[PDB]
């Protein structure tokens, strides 16, 4: 499933993460746009041996399990297929997790990168 | 128009406290990312730690426990409690405004902290 | 030991071309963390000199340039002048770390 910006910053305000840990809703949105462009199907491999799956590009080695990445911790407690559905549940709360570690919303590098310091309120705008 | 003047540098005996003041002027905090950033005499640029826009802090492995970044909207000032100084924290400390990325777009002029008896 | 490295000292006469490398790890550079430089004058604040891994802030000459390619990072300048002398600093986030990090600085000499 390929989403528009409107109807993913719709699901993401119905999911609870407008203000999520002091982070604003066009974070979240500018954040899958520049690490999946917002495809729910995307799978990146890593040459590390792990693969960041979903919208939010979660990673295999320290938060899903996807039983091919050595050396996994599992910290979010689910099988990365659960985060390639077209349902944005199982994603929005392995990222209230992570968001929720030392590194905050900077373990995504798309949204260091890209999003922080910005005008993410534009990323909500007119919806 | 933008403006960072930094205050409360001065002397103190290892093991002491010290509160550092930013007062900024033509642009407001709450709305921008903030850091602290120091530099010891001839030495190179140490990151120290940082406020986000949103509220939340951030800290380097080396000020751990010891620093408290916070922020105070009625006077648009930023502060640094530093709690059990050493002699490796003898430095200039900067007050900084970040732009795209953690960038550094505009730097104060700098307070000197000395740390001896 | 070291977060990011850059040379202690590099020098050049006028009007040659020198680079300034800085290598990182698998917890900065090489986790996809973009690398900005400063240029810091004597008796003076640093000043944003590289900012992503190649843009230039408005009053910087084209002379500066940036690339950076897996693990490493590096600043060109061609065309090497007497304003050019200070100390240069590369700079990028780590995350196993949590936090925002500098190179250990360069000297730059221009010798002529």
């Known amino acids: 499933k390929v989403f528009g910006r409107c109807e993913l910053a719709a699901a993401m305000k119905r999911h609870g993460l407008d203000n999520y840990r002091g982070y604003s809703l066009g974070n979240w949105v500018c954040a899958a746009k520049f690490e999946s462009n917002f495809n729910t199907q995307a799978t990146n491999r890593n040459t590390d041996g792990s693969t960041d799956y979903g919208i939010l590009q979660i990673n295999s080695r320290w938060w899903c399990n996807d039983g091919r990445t050595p050396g996994s911790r599992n910290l979010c407690n689910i099988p990365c297929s659960a985060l390639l559905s077209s349902d944005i549940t199982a994603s929005v709360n392995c990222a209230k997790k992570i968001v929720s570690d030392g590194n905050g919303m900077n373990a995504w590098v798309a949204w260091r990168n890209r999003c922080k310091g910005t005008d993410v309120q534009a990323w909500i705008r007119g919806c | 128009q933008v403006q960072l003047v930094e205050s409360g540098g001065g002397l103190v005996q290892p093991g002491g406290p010290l509160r550092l003041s930013c007062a900024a002027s033509?642009?407001?905090?709450?709305?921008?990312?903030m850091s602290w950033v120091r530099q010891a005499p001839g030495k190179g640029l140490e990151w120290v730690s940082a406020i986000y826009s949103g509220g939340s802090t951030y800290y380097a492995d080396s000020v751990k426990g010891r620093f408290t970044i916070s922020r105070d909207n009625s006077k648009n000032t930023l502060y640094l409690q530093m709690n059990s100084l050493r002699a490796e924290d003898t430095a200039v400390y900067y007050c900084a405004r970040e732009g795209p990325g953690d960038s550094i777009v505009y730097w104060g002029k700098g307070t000197l902290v000395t740390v001896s008896s | 030991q070291s977060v990011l490295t850059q040379p202690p000292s590099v020098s050049g006469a006028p009007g040659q071309r020198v680079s300034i490398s800085c290598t990182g790890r698998?917890?900065?550079?090489?986790?996809?963390?973009?690398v900005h430089w400063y240029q810091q004058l004597p008796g003076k604040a640093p000043k944003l000199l590289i900012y992503g891994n190649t843009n230039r802030p408005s009053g910087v000459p084209v002379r500066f340039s940036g690339s950076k390619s897996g693990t490493s990072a590096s600043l060109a300048i061609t065309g090497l002048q007497a304003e050019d002398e200070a100390d240069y600093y590369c700079?990028?986030?780590?995350?196993?770390?949590?936090?925002?990090?500098f190179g250990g600085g360069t000297k730059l000499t221009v010798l002529g």
């Open positions: 698998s917890s900065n550079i090489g986790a996809g963390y973009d």
């Open positions: 700079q990028s986030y780590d995350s196993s770390l949590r936090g925002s990090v």
């Open positions: 033509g642009f407001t905090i709450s709305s921008n990312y």
